[PDB]
Amino acid sequence: GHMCDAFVGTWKLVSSENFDDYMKEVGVGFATRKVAGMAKPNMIISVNGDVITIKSESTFKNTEISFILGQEFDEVTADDRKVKSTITLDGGVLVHVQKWDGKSTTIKRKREDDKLVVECVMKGVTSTRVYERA
Ligand SMILES: O=C(O)C(F)(F)C(F)(F)C(F)(F)C(F)(F)C(F)(F)C(F)(F)C(F)(F)F
Numbered sequence: 001g002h003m004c005d006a007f008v009g010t011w012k013l014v015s016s017e018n019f020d021d022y023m024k025e026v027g028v029g030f031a032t033r034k035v036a037g038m039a040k041p042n043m044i045i046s047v048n049g050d051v052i053t054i055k056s057e058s059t060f061k062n063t064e065i066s067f068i069l070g071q072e073f074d075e076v077t078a079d080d081r082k083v084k085s086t087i088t089l090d091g092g093v094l095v096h097v098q099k100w101d102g103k104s105t106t107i108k109r110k111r112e113d114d115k116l117v118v119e120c121v122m123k124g125v126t127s128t129r130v131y132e133r134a
């Protein structure tokens, strides 16, 4: 169970680019966009056998997803979309696709330098969020 060894630990947000535009394209409502943009989340990534957990903690809301690489699962996103999610390990990157309502979005969680970078894409709109170790 070593696929995710470069991701495990705790992380805190450094910077965010185009995040509100990404959320707009996804369809997130105004108030959720404003709370999300204001959060300084702490991310916890952990491995228990085959099951990986990604937890995001912020002042007003936490999320927690647990999954096996390659196995589709149900996710209720923070903006309350009911999506079908699959996360795979491709070239050292966690590639997460969410499918719902005839639409898709991809969240790539990757390593760059000493950082964990989250790249979100919806119909050509890309957000880049950089985390440092907590
Ligand atoms: O509208 C809500 O219910 C909310 F709580 F404001 C929220 F925006 F969804 C949120 F969950 F807090 C959040 F900000 F989106 C978040 F916590 F999920 C996040 F985006 F900050 C993180 F990065 F933690 F996921």
Ligand SMILES: O=C(O)C(F)(F)C(F)(F)C(F)(F)C(F)(F)C(F)(F)C(F)(F)C(F)(F)F
Binding pocket: 023, 026, 028, 032, 036, 043, 056, 077, 078, 079, 080, 107, 118, 120, 129
């Ligand atoms: O920083 C991250 O870990 C993240 F993955 F980029 C994310 F911010 F959590 C997010 F997935 F983009 C997101 F915030 F959850 C969201 F934008 F997708 C959303 F729409 F679910 C919400 F509602 F939280 F904004």
